Design an enzyme around this catalytic site. Sequence first.
Site, mmCIF file in Angstrom:
data_model
loop_
_atom_site.group_PDB
_atom_site.id
_atom_site.type_symbol
_atom_site.label_atom_id
_atom_site.label_comp_id
_atom_site.label_asym_id
_atom_site.label_seq_id
_atom_site.Cartn_x
_atom_site.Cartn_y
_atom_site.Cartn_z
ATOM 1 N N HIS A 107 0.857 -1.172 0.000
ATOM 2 C CA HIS A 107 0.000 0.000 0.000
ATOM 3 C C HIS A 107 0.898 1.230 0.000
ATOM 4 C CE1 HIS A 107 -3.049 2.920 1.022
ATOM 5 N NE2 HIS A 107 -2.451 3.187 2.169
ATOM 6 N N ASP A 136 -2.804 9.940 2.692
ATOM 7 C CA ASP A 136 -3.100 8.521 2.528
ATOM 8 C C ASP A 136 -4.453 8.387 1.851
ATOM 9 O OD1 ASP A 136 -3.255 5.768 2.665
ATOM 10 O OD2 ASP A 136 -3.111 5.671 4.860
ATOM 11 N N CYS A 189 -3.994 3.436 -4.915
ATOM 12 C CA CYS A 189 -3.086 4.071 -3.939
ATOM 13 C C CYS A 189 -1.881 4.755 -4.592
ATOM 14 C CB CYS A 189 -2.584 3.012 -2.934
ATOM 15 S SG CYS A 189 -1.898 1.539 -3.751
#
Lengths: 244, 76
Positions: A107, A136, A189
């Site tokens: 991630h 994030d 991501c």
Amino acid sequence: LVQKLIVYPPPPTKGGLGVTNEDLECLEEGEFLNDVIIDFYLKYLILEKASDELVERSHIFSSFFYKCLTRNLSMAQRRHKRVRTWTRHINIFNKDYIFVPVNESSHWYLAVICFPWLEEAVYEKMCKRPCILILDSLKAASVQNTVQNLREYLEVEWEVKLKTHRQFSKTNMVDLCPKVPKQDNSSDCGVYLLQYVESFFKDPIVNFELPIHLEKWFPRHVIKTKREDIRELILKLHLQQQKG
Amino acid sequence: HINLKVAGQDGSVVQFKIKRHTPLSKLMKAYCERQGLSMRQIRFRFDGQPINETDTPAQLEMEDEDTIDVFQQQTG
């Protein structure tokens, strides 16, 4: 047969990163971005999209910096020794923004160390603070560990380069999570990481009053076409580099 | 002749002797071979910067006992 589409920046310039047709595969929808695409696009942003003021006040670490850091002396000193030469010609204590791409458990997310030369918040009437921003597109469990590892990197880098003792703690370098636009699928991501850096260069964070509202930081259409835009950019640079 | 360290993600370190003006290409190939991977799978970095097969220690201004970091691919 894998062949290199581009080397960026191209020779004679030193430090060029090779991008192959195999690296382009990760830009197809639903695929996880790899370190080559991340590192290529972040170098493209700093070399072609960042303002000249931002370039001088910013440093972008390779996506392997954090992985290398966390692979007599204390444990903090031992981690720092692994990356000690990665700032050979850089005084990070003279930068306003230090960007750290983080890959933990497949991630991507972004840590930004902000105004590390300040020791407390100052208002002049915007508020600038020494702090670590976590940007994030999903949610990473490792965030507090990342933030503490980065505070401990700063302490040792300071002692090594400035040769005094300076503490970086939660009170001295608070961790903040701005409200940024988030992911809607399970594989973008890395695309958001790149968009966060791009939008930071277009519109840097200069007011650190909380909450930091970045919900409208970039429009939806730019993120929905980013994979194709990055691929088209690499193909354009490929044709340019064929000519020379 | 200088000695270079190649430091991998598992904590191991491998030593190589190389002349200041030899391109790094054959050290990199020898490293991939001795640990069983391909060039397309290993990222070589020096002071955090990409290292290419064309580069020599002289041009990168390496010194004796410098370390090259090697990483495998990252995805997210």
